[PDB]
Amino acid sequence: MKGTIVGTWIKTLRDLYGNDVVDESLKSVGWEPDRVITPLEDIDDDEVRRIFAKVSEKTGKNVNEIWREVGRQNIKTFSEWFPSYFAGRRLVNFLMMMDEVHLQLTKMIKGATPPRLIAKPVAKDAIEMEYVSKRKMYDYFLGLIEGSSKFFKEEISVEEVERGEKDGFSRLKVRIKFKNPVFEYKK
Amino acid sequence: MKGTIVGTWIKTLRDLYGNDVVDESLKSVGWEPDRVITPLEDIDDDEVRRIFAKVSEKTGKNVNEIWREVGRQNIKTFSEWFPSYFAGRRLVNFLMMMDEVHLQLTKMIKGATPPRLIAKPVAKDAIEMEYVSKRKMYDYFLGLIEGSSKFFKEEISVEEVERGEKDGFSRLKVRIKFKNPVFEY
Amino acid sequence: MKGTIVGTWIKTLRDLYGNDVVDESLKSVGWEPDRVITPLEDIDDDEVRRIFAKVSEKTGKNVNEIWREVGRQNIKTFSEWFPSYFAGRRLVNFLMMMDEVHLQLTKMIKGATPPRLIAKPVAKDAIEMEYVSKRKMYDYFLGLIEGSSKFFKEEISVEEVERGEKDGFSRLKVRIKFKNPVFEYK
Numbered sequence: 001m002k003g004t005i006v007g008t009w010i011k012t013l014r015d016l017y018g019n020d021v022v023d024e025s026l027k028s029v030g031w032e033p034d035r036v037i038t039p040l041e042d043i044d045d046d047e048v049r050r051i052f053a054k055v056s057e058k059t060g061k062n063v064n065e066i067w068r069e070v071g072r073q074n075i076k077t078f079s080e081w082f083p084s085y086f087a088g089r090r091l092v093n094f095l096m097m098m099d100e101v102h103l104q105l106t107k108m109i110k111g112a113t114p115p116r117l118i119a120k121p122v123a124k125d126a127i128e129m130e131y132v133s134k135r136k137m138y139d140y141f142l143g144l145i146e147g148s149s150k151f152f153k154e155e156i157s158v159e160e161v162e163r164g165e166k167d168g169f170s171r172l173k174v175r176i177k178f179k180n181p182v183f184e185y186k187k
Numbered sequence: 188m189k190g191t192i193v194g195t196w197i198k199t200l201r202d203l204y205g206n207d208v209v210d211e212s213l214k215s216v217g218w219e220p221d222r223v224i225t226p227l228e229d230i231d232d233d234e235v236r237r238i239f240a241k242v243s244e245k246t247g248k249n250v251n252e253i254w255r256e257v258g259r260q261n262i263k264t265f266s267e268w269f270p271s272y273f274a275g276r277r278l279v280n281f282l283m284m285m286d287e288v289h290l291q292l293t294k295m296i297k298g299a300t301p302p303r304l305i306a307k308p309v310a311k312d313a314i315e316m317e318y319v320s321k322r323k324m325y326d327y328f329l330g331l332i333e334g335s336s337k338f339f340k341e342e343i344s345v346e347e348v349e350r351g352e353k354d355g356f357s358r359l360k361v362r363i364k365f366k367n368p369v370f371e372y
Numbered sequence: 373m374k375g376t377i378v379g380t381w382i383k384t385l386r387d388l389y390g391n392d393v394v395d396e397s398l399k400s401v402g403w404e405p406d407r408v409i410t411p412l413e414d415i416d417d418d419e420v421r422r423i424f425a426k427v428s429e430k431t432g433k434n435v436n437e438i439w440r441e442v443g444r445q446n447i448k449t450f451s452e453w454f455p456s457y458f459a460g461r462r463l464v465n466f467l468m469m470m471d472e473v474h475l476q477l478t479k480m481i482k483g484a485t486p487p488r489l490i491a492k493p494v495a496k497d498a499i500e501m502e503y504v505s506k507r508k509m510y511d512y513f514l515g516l517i518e519g520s521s522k523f524f525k526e527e528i529s530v531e532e533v534e535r536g537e538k539d540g541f542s543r544l545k546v547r548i549k550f551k552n553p554v555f556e557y558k
């Protein structure tokens with residue numbers, strides 16, 4: 001994982017659960033609590049895994065619930081980093097465009113490997129979006145969608161329709177329903 | 188053709204010529220007049236061709252003129268679907284970018300095969316746009332250009348300079364003149 | 373070089389130093405002073421070099437400072453060509469997106485070959501941008517950066533880190549420092 005996102009995860013945990021929940025979890029993996037992380041350095045994913053587990057232990061929350069909440073928060077932060085990915089979009093545009101956006105981000109943040117997110121309009125008012133990765137961060141995936149709904153102020157319902165691990169990849173498909181048609185024809 | 192665009196055509200034909208005309212046209216090709224079409228289903232092009240023919244027969248309007256008008260109307264609709272492809276562009280930007288947008292759309296609407304649109308800055312205040320497709324929807328192409336002009340509120344003159352079915356591909360080249368330079372200083 | 377860009381430069385040289393310096397510099401390479409330059413014709417690079425050489429000789433200005441000035445001036449023009457590349461971006465966004473933008477320009481302007489511009493966020497408040505080209509227009513590169521800074525109204529500090537030519541390619545690496553973080557939290 002790139003320092004860019006991780007540095008942000010740390011700071012988001014700090015806002016969510018407090019400083020010396022985060023301080024002590026950081027110590028748990030042998031980091032000084034005020035460790036400075038650079039945007040392009042490589043952080044061991046397992047260290048991140050261990051950090052989030054400790055926060056869970058310390059907070060009484062399941063880690064999946066924490067990843068979800070962090071996913072919710074991060075949409076706003078991403079919107080500050082790259083407002084032009086958000087500007088003038090419908091929510092459904094934003095979600096359908098996200099795989100292509102992640103691909104452009106890999107050309108700008110060397111070594112970044114965001115997941116594949118192929119989205120498909122399956123009905124007049126719904127898409128299916130499939131998360132595909134070597135990393136299995138289902139809950140973060142869902143939180144980011146929820147956070148996207150809040151950012152665009154378009155209500156959705158999200159249902160998991162499929163989950164699975166095949167040939168080294170984690171996969172998760174959701175069906176997302178909107179209040180208006182995806183491709184509405186109007187007067 | 189993908190149901191996405193076909194569903195839109197049907198509704199556009201209904202607004203233009205009425206429900207009873209479209210229903211009967213749908214029936215004439217063996218569809219429920221109220222056929223439910225999903226965004227990604229594959230609709231036979233020849234059935235669409237026949238629907239449009241029957242509408243022309245019933246309204247008395249030449250089918251070419253029907254395509255041109257459907258093209259004029261559809262620009263508005265596309266701008267409601269994907270407003271960020273329109274926002275902050277000059278018309279000439281919009282037209283020159285259209286080939287890449289159609290490509291990005293193939294990545295979002297699986298199996299869509301919109302025409303190739305080679306656009307070239309040919310003179311200071313003019314471009315050439317070449318439509319290249321296996322479908323020969325000349326008038327529709329011309330309608331979308333006209334619709335874009337109205338949407339961006341930039342008057343243009345468009346002259347067809349080339350028409351022909353070279354390969355398995357139909358091709359149509361137009362010269363598009365703007366009131367502004369393409370690359371204005 | 374494509375005529376689209378050469379014509380802009382001619383117009384910029386005229387704005388800066390006047391029609392007489394430019395007219396004589398065009399004649400010097402065998403052009404009519406009012407020769408029409410089409411957006412897609414291909415202009416010989418060495419002719420452009422000699423034109424800029426003659427302008428330097430006639431004005432007394434160092435050719436490097438000329439390219440720098442022209443680069444500063446041109447950002448505003450580019451924003452008139454393609455405002456949607458500037459719209460709603462932060463300066464750091466604009467600079468990191470430029471390589472993909474130059475790549476998409478080659479798809480709209482046939483035969484255009486802008487330099488490769490690899491940018492890397494190297495620190496919390498700075499990026500590295502490496503200019504790489506078959507051509508050697510270091511000062512134009514730097515002026516365009518300064519011009520970007522002015523257009524986006526965001527101050528930067530620019531430091532050269534490395535420059536050099538190998539097997540026909542010129543490279544220039546700068547470090548660009550901002551007043552605000554690249555990936556700001558809250």
Ligand code: HEM
Binds near residue numbers: 135
């Ligand atoms: C402009 C908005 C966004 C930006 C800038 C962004 C950026 C990133 C970055 C930089 C990474 C790091 C990859 C790495 O370190 O190797 C990442 C990972 C991730 N991104 Fe995006 N993201 C955005 C929106 C989204 C959205 C809407 C989703 C919705 C699913 C999403 C899903 C994920 C997930 C689940 C990961 C976790 C790593 C993994 O699953 O393997 N992102 N994102």
Ligand code: HEM
Binds near residue numbers: 265289320
């Ligand atoms: C954002 C604006 C636009 C969108 C979203 C859009 C989208 C589409 C879609 C979904 C199709 C269906 C393809 C299929 O079913 O395989 C299509 C086909 C087509 N597009 Fe576009 N389009 C846009 C603008 C334009 C413009 C400006 C032109 C021409 C100047 C154009 C020319 C055409 C034509 C003529 C067809 C069908 C005819 C054929 O196959 O030759 N479109 N477009």
Ligand code: HEM
Binds near residue numbers: 376514
């Ligand atoms: C949206 C803004 C921009 C546009 C539309 C643009 C477009 C172009 C075009 C059309 C060319 C001519 C290619 C040819 O004739 O072969 C060019 C060359 C060049 N561009 Fe860009 N450019 C933009 C922004 C920038 C920026 C921010 C830089 C930053 C340095 C830059 C650096 C250069 C350089 C140094 C050259 C030609 C010299 C060489 O090969 O070294 N441009 N640009």
